[PDB]
Paper text:
The main protease of SARS-CoV-2 (Mpro, also referred to as 3-chymotrypsin-like protease or 3CLpro) is responsible for the majority of nsp processing, cleaving at 11 conserved sites along the polyprotein including self-excision of Mpro by autolytic cleavage of its own N-terminal and C-terminal autoprocessing sites. SARS-CoV-2 Mpro is a functional homodimer of two symmetrically disposed protomers that are each 306 residues in length (33.8 kDa). The active site of Mpro features a Cys145-His41 catalytic dyad, which orchestrates nucleophilic attack at the carbonyl carbon of the invariant P1 glutamine and the formation of an acyl enzyme intermediate central to efficient peptide cleavage. Using C-terminally substituted Mpro chimeras, we have determined X-ray crystallographic structures of Mpro in complex with 10 of its 11 viral cleavage sites, bound at full occupancy intermolecularly in trans, within the active site of either the native enzyme and/or a catalytic mutant (C145A).
Author numbering:
A (entry chain B), B (entry chain A): 1 to 306
Amino acid sequence: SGFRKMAFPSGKVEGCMVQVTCGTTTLNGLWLDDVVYCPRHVICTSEDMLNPNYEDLLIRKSNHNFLVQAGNVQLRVIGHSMQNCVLKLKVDTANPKTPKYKFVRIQPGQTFSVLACYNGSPSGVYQCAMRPNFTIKGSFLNGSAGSVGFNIDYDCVSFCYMHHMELPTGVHAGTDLEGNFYGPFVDRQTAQAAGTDTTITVNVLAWLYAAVINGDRWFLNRFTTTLNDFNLVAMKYNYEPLTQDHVDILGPLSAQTGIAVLDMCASLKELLQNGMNGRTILGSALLEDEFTPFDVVRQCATVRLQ
Amino acid sequence: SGFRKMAFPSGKVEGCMVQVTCGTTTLNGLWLDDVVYCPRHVICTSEDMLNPNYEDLLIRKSNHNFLVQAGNVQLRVIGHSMQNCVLKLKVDTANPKTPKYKFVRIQPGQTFSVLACYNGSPSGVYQCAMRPNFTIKGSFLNGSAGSVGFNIDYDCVSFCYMHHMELPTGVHAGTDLEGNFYGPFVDRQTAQAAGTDTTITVNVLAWLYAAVINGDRWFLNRFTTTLNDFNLVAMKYNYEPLTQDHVDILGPLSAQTGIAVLDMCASLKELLQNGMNGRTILGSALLEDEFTPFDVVRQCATVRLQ
Ligand code: NA
Ligand code: NA
């Protein structure tokens, strides 16, 4: 059947993307109902990014200072609002292509689809994960601010991310659709420490469960370990600690196979201590931490009634 | 910054995805103008799949024997014709969401975006490359036939692939939108095998250039080798030879980096001889053959006006 990291079909999100222009700075905005959400720094000037006083800058701006465009049609702005680090532009027209949407804040280790846009036009879509240090290993160039991260559940598009900035390490940071930054970051061009980026342990365990189902099982031991002992070893090897919520997520895969979560944890604990030493798991010498138990269950090959 | 295997936005393709049902078997269909394209084995029963007489089966089929549904709306089939391995169903309505499009036959080593659909409804989008043996290492389940692969240039959607079946090895095969299969395969449940799967070397060279872009160069040498010598060494391993066209495609990468293409070839040549099996930490991270030079160029910052 094959395993592939998949983004959700972006057609619903592409219908809410508009161009927001302020001065000579143009970047993307999210048009839902009669509100357009965009990053704050559209109002910023070149010299005023080290420590912008956004509230003072916003007052000097007016409604006609913002140009919102959706294709050949231009949208008229009736008001501007600052919700944390996100600018809310009320327009005179509701988006007819507005889908059933809800705003969600995701936890580290979860995945979502990113629609990278430039000048208001969608350019590409990719799947990524929220790193434990609240960064994302995305692919963004200058002008990609305003791109949104999302997940589609049935018919409801659950928006969870908006891109703002790129850190010096090369990773990217942003806010939820309510303007609150993921992690201890601010939208200022000043030195900011992201913190150590640990490996998503729950996704690695799901990867190991996928390997066991597909036949890769050289790395298994009959031993079981306590959660405390595994968490101690995991942090010594820069693995994110395993919580009760992570174990609950791993429940379906552990039941589909015969391996208890702490049984698999003992296998991974000895894996970390000894290394892979020439052996490969699922065809790679490295482990995957951005493939979720959701992804494994939906894409795994099943038995065949003959 | 940041490199990610990105797929083209699937909105334009999403608007052409319909559900084609013949008897009890249901597949996906591509609705362009007043014609719906779908795999022809939709007319097959549970039997008639080991060795089908597609001409005989389709001659017995009637126009009302096909049920085409787009959302809740159901389209009437006014005509049916066979184009090689693909069924062309003329419907009573031209698709109003039809984009500017053309039918393209890709070459091995090139990439495109797959929109996986089930029951005519889009489910996920991922990027993949045509393997040297004309197979696809995709993620497909039963009922995914009719899913299409595409590339987007401006507003023109270049359809290049429609998924049909899965080989016992787990890889997938399909046809162009003209019904002609990619590879020596046929749409029959018979014993078929793909050719030797080799590494698309021009893509790994592009991957190495991206690693240089990210600031990692501790696996390069200052040596240069001729193309003929590299190809002999490369062909001894399971690597495809470099054509002059491949070098020309790699030219922009060399210009942006200052590393000669043959310089990078010698670096790869030395790595292979020293035992880069693709089974070590440095081999499994540097050996990626599904990231084209265009992807590296399209995700890089060019000359920067300061
Ligand atoms: Na164990
Ligand atoms: Na070299």
